[model samples]
Target chain A: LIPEPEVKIEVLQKPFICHRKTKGGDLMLVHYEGYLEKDGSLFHSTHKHNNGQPIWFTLGILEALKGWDQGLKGMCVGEKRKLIIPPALGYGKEGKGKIPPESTLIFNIDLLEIRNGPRSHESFQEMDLNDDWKLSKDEVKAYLKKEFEKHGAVVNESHHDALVEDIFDKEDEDKDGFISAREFTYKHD
Target chain B: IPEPEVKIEVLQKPFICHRKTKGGDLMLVHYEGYLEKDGSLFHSTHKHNNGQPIWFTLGILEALKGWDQGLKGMCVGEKRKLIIPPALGYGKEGKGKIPPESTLIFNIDLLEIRNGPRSHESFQEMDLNDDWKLSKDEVKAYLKKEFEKHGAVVNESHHDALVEDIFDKEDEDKDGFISAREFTYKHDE
Candidate 1:
């Protein structure tokens, strides 16, 4: 047999938020670059294309190759990290169309954004772990509002504040001060 | 000053939609997404756990930029169908996940709004990976160390968590880890 190829990896950089366990189907927007170790050649890149132009990948799909598949799981939103992939987890012997055989690939990834699939009551696992100021809806609203203002658009305070507040309220259900991922779910019809 | 991170291209002609909001910071919305060519599903906000339409918002980056803009000025409980170009949806690179290129479609719904967080200090310095010569054991140690740092445990099966799953299966090993012997004879693959 194939000796059950012993798999190993070394995280050159920890994906930004190591705290939260990323769920499949979460929406993620990220920037990345990859290359090989043989001749210092370029394999793939999303950087030179342009700014304001990021790549969005849904978790738990065949979208990305091996490196991204291994790296993106369990990452929190806005996390960044670098991965050094071995041939085993990489393209294997034949490699992809352009990638060479038995190459060690390196990638720099920025987990710039994410949107979780709607859940009921926001899982305590989701709400509890990352509930720093980062998880607060008011904070996210401020971000969107600032972006809108920068574009010279008026802020829709009603929609902005309410959505985030709802997220928080769901977390803080039962009139208690704490909200856990288990307790929260996306309120829907 | 700078541009946004995501990019979209509306392959099909532009379509219009209506939207509504719940009073607060969030620009509430409900949306349905379909593939441009076949009108298959990409995503939707109307379907809930019980298979019903629910309210969402445009205030968050959860929705693509162009799609979000299309829903602008909508009132609470508004609904609309929008044709989003790749420029407004998934761009040319088509994030390796489920998101494909071309025109994107969305039928949006407006829902209750709420507030969110403010700061984006999470954005880190753009740093590339330093060229390092790591051995197989070293790489494994690194990956394991980082996994432990985050309190995550991984067997070989979880190897694709990162982008490692992106590579094609030509490498000698299909697992994510490599050995020093394999690394040296990598070209032999």
Candidate 2:
């Protein structure tokens, strides 16, 4: 069986953020150039295309490739990094137009800035049945089940179970079966 | 003065968890595009569509250069101001109402983000039967049904070729069959 993709990231420049740092669900402005690791041929360059302007996207949202979402975590604005992405993380067996299948990709990235966005209350509140302003494991299970049914996305039993467990464990900070509104807040860097 | 290049300024940041934009994702936004020099509104989604959000794919060159790059990492419900240089705008020869070599500006409010048509729905549909494995025959049958539903001619030889390609791509282990594991990883949308 083919192995899972291994992603490596190296920082070239680090920026200091007085108020905040990069995290999952954060929107970030970034400049980047993608290349094939084998021949080092450039596949895409946002800098060249936009005359040095950066691109923006939410982190960990599958907005870009899985590798990018995983690799760019915990980055700060004004930070520069090199990302080494394996085929699984980059494009997999079925690649895009120019990117070859099973190709190992490299990218040089510059995190130019971060745009703080609005908090997502729906994701948390949806689990709060009856609008009681709190959540229980039963409520969480029901919500996730509905979501899975609505999407019809077939995730393996383990993944589905893990998702439910992880969300509950984190949100139930007081070791209680219920999660308070304060307990459902986002974590900081 | 020479073109001023792209500039982004966040106007509002939401208090809940932020959901940023990413490539290959669909975004719905409301925006006003105008000349930076004259401030004359050349175009706006609010006016044109009765304030309906403009829906488009992100990071795929589907939008203007400034939009494609500048709007990358915005959060849902977050408002921002964007200044686009000619290089990333209409260039030296502006389009329609926009003047030649004029700088452009946009006030944007991101509304929502989602997977495009070919991303999640296709994968979910593939597993609608709830079977953990998808056989080659099942795939071909699906193609036939879809082709007929779309009113397309079912060319037997071409249809077979397409099926083989899909099966080959989905069967990551070259085992000539696809399991739930393979399907989930390949179609992680």
Candidate 3:
């Protein structure tokens, strides 16, 4: 009997939506659960924490991986779905234990929420200070302000819609329409 | 058969660092950079000296969810590799520049931190304990005791109702023993 010639499945790749620019480049929050299939056996999950805490990150604007940048376009709040990915979208050649090399993986994601992006051009401005990091709100904002000021552009907070909303919204409670002293006093604890 | 457990591996990237306390509290700091397929930088904190790095309390907004949860158990300077799905990162409307339906590869390094209640971090590995599960009332009482210890509210009525819902579904075949598998609930929050 002839041995079966070496065969490899050509991993498939596609982006259902490719705006390349997520409408909301602000921060995002999500919760997820996943199963690891090693030779077809599930071995892990991160969904048991029903305590309502979700993961958060800036949108395709560059705080996460490239695959993620291309994948999360047009997602709205409270959306959930599963995604199948190849090793290129995961840990390449060095697959961790039980995650056999070149294994395709699966994940279930819930777009629990989305926070609006930064407050100002400076806050959202993309800067090239260094490699390997995304700019924080203030840094981006400052950079924008400095650039405009040098050009005599005189940009205002209104010009930066991302941070135009009350920064206090980060602390507001009632949605009842505003941030109070108590909210402000409550530091980043 | 038992259901799967949550697994997280923290990639100990040198530039990133966070801290967590044994009591279950945490403090952390880190930088993230999104790169294009060609490895060209798209965004980052270090870009053009735009802003300061982000800092946060564990379980707080400044950091991502995986770090908040996993860092609770890691010591300072401890590095980890985590394989996270869109579930843990983005959900539906993928972040800007970031795509939807993508899994994230994070390289996190524990730098400094504190925690509250070490026992709360027990989800790190799969549970091996199979105790003779308690009935609804017993579970309520048990939970109440634990909550009261933490100075949290003690809503006996709510607990009673929760326990009832919990076992009422798990008591398959009317057997007294509530196996974990039979007792698992599809977390739908």
Candidate 4:
């Protein structure tokens, strides 16, 4: 059986480490170079062709390759990373231009700037652990802990338990023990 | 002197070694249309035309000035956003959906490029048997398939009539088959 192509991301430059990682629906200014994975032959570059203007792409929009759309999430501005995308995410069996059939692609991406999209009404959608459309203190704390950990921050549950208390105290109206959609939207960020 | 009104931004670059399009090249493009004044979406191939791209030719008066003038030297799989000023757009008298002196914004995806009429040697694609010959049935099937790919629904009699016309005009020998010498179909409308 054929193995799946794995998407590997390696950070190459982080001149200024940043907070506020990107999520879906954000418009990003990016410069990138694409190459064939097998021979490392350059196939595309924004700098060489587009002159001074970087490509303006919106995250999670169908404006890019599947690999770029999926692999480019959670990136910080000014961060440079090398992305190795499998054929399934890159172009699949039908390749275009300089790419061949079922060709794996490599790209070096420099994220210049990010313009955040409008706030989602379901702001705490990911933090809502269950499908009940509500968020509990435990769920909110778990989400914060995971995010901080993903950013390589060393922390314990108590580290953000204090934050959870403050959040619940302010946003959780009626002392209902759970945050509803109304409470979340009313205290929208 | 000031910069020209038409501006082109490379939203996505083409492959490095890919062939650039020239004047008179047939282009198949998918696109979204917007108004630069308010950034309102006014047209999309994805919304109509059976979700298929449309075929066009460059360097011709087939479309707007920005379309014919700004869209050149592009490769298949390249995406560009063209900002068309009033002179290049509807001018002082706009048509149907567009306003007068409206600046048009077109996000283009160049899907396919056809440079020349197919040569007889390119019969490799049309010939299903690969025997250097095309029977009436083979030609009918191939032509019908091509129509389907080009987003046309060729009905039963319509498909048969086309094959009969082609054979009557080009088969020459009336031997019920098209030989290598007889496969001289070149240009298409």
Candidate 5:
């Protein structure tokens, strides 16, 4: 048997704005097409199956394949890349209905947008300037404002306010007007 | 086998959002479809084949007839189980993997709702900064332009009155901001 190729990533197109690179746990919107390496036959595509809407997913979360997690690192918005995944990183022994056994999957991906999920423990600790284990509305709001701004997208006050509102609504437990350390889960050091 | 009627059964009620979905609203949802005949799964947002929530405009036949009717008046965070007869589903022709004359069963969870086009227009018109949210100052500023157009909005007092009146009537929750829900109904005024 011929030696199978390792997962390979080739950048087809660079990002329009390289404001930030793809990192673990960041939410991403993308459109991609998967084809079989044997015949270059189409298997799946967001544009074909998903009504032209991009796929919204969290990176490096195992919500997708290990190949995708490894392949998408350092990708940026508007970046297009091609990834070739050997079956070991793909379906492996039990190939899917469309995919054959020991198939080498190929994907062409276009990153549309990158969005922040929430403040991680490392970032949260930094945001707590007072050494408190809680996050005030202003603290979180200021943090969120900068997070959105880092994307190089123009964000106005109203847009910034909505992000703050959403964070508070989801993370502020006990209606305590703040997100305590207990409210957000993290691996404490 | 019994004949299945196209109907919607609310599995979970929404948490007091006040706004209900209608035509032209963008609905973000997670859904699972099954064949009612043998209870075989067809498609699901949770499946590895496709693991992303879908966003579609409601009530414009962007979806099945059964879905348009079943999802009407549903609020965000609500879940519904829809029984779709052939007439409202893929019909006798049936879709891929779905047998002919098969009935469709769908469990849909509405994740979020965006304003219809009318409210989008309202936001664009009032928010000079192009933010998605509408603040009092933005509304007041837009009113200034409108009054200038009609030749009556020269005085700050007059402008403030209109701004106040708008908030009083349109800002249903007294949140100091007018959102999509408030603007949708207030467009006539």
Candidate 6:
């Protein structure tokens, strides 16, 4: 008999130092592997991609697959879990490139890190150039300086010229070089 | 990305111009540069490319910082002077013609600016298949279609080479395929 439930979450491990559980709209860093439930053939694994860099996705933002949003909720950092997802909760009947249509999915996930907001959330906050929740030309300059330093690169004359000319004026503080945070929030947001 | 802010002064504004330069646009310009302290001629478009306009992508990581920031709002036929600090120039070690800690000056003529390849923007459109790999065939098909759409006919050998090159770059782990992480890593970086 087939399972009645559409989604099933099985906790495999929870570390001793469990912090706040994942909440909707929180950015989370996770490592995971997914496969077909029927054959156990590995289909996807973060460990196999780009030397295991964690996937960062914001909950409730639909940045990840629907199954991830449903299964990863309430998970804690340092926890491991298995999610069994029916076709409706997974990729559905149309299926994707390699995944067969209506195939049930299984995912083994490891929650690594969690932070507030989405991927570019902190970047915008940092770009709050004056810390008054506003960005001026001077502040934008400062952010550019810090960014170059972080990348271990030097800004050349042409690079600086383009940014100030194009982007700084585009965000629209309505005739002022300075733009408030409300108008210049993260591009994605 | 400049450490010290670049100083820009518009020398002549165009009487009439429909297009102004923007970040992420491809730009063409003619420039003459001198050392700031002594005003010694160091570089010029006059000597290189037979006075032809130099083409470069503007306002992104690819261009120098001063240009990235300074060239943004320039209109065609406008001339501007830029005073670039060392952090935005060649830096302390300098180059063959540029001395260490040298501030530089440049007079530039904005020739043209046009929309650049929206690589990353279009890249985000692809669905992350259940297998999580952007397969060689899929990428090849996309590339072929893209090139064909642009009216550039790609022969079999050229098409194969292009696919191979893209796959090699995207496959950071050298796993013979590009995982979703690798796809984003190559494009984002």
Better lDDT candidate (2, 6): 2
Candidate 4 C-alpha lDDT tens digits along A1-189: 124556888888764545334455667889999999899999989989957578988876446887787677767678888999988888888787779989989999999987645434333554554535777888777655543333222344554565566567666778988888767664343
The TM-score, computed over Cα atoms with residue i paired to residue i, of candidate 1 is: 0.30
Q: What digit string (tens of lDDT, one per residue) describes model 2 on residues B94-128?
A: 88899889899899987887753323334434543
Over the stretch B85-165, how does candidate 3's per-residue lDDT look in tens digits? 555555456576657755555445455653332121121111212143434444444444333322234455545554555
Please state the Cα-based DockQ of model 6 relative to the true two-chain complex: 0.01
**For model 4 chain A, the run of ten residues with the poorest summed lDDT:** A147-156
Model 1 agreement with the true structure over A86-140: per-residue lDDT tens digits: 7876788778888888988877777767654444222222222232322345434
Could you list the chain B TM-scores for each candidate?
0.41, 0.61, 0.41, 0.60, 0.60, 0.61
Stretches of candidate 2 exceeding 4 Å from the true structure: A1-189, B1-5, B117-189
Steric overlap count per candidate: 121, 13, 69, 1, 0, 31
Candidate 6: where is the Cα deviation over 4 Å? A1-189, B1-4, B117-121, B126-189
Distance from true location, Cα of A74 in model 3, Å = 1.6
lDDT of 5 at B130: 41
lDDT preference between candidates 3 and 5, better one: 5
**Preferred candidate (TM-score higher): 1 or 6:** 6
* Model 6: TM-score for chain B: 0.61
Instruction: For each candidate in the order shown, give its overall lDDT on alpha carbons.
Output: 0.47, 0.66, 0.43, 0.69, 0.68, 0.65
Model 5 alpha-carbon miss at residue B181, Å: 54
| Model 5 agreement with the true structure over B83-179: per-residue lDDT tens digits | 9988888887787888778789999999997753343433554544444557888766554443232122145654465466657766778989877
Q: What stretches of model 4 exceed 4 Å from their correct place?
A: A6-28, A35-76, A81-86, A96-100, A104-106, A114-132, A142-161, A169-178, A185-187, B1-189
User: Deviation in angstroms for A22 in model 6?
Assistant: 20
Per-residue lDDT tens digits for candidate 2, residues A13-132, read 855432234555567888899999989999889978967677887986567788898688656567788999988787888888898888999999988776654435544544554445
* DockQ of every candidate structure: 0.02, 0.02, 0.02, 0.01, 0.01, 0.01
Lowest lDDT block of 10, candidate 5 chain B: B145-154
Q: Just chain B of model 1: what TM-score?
A: 0.41
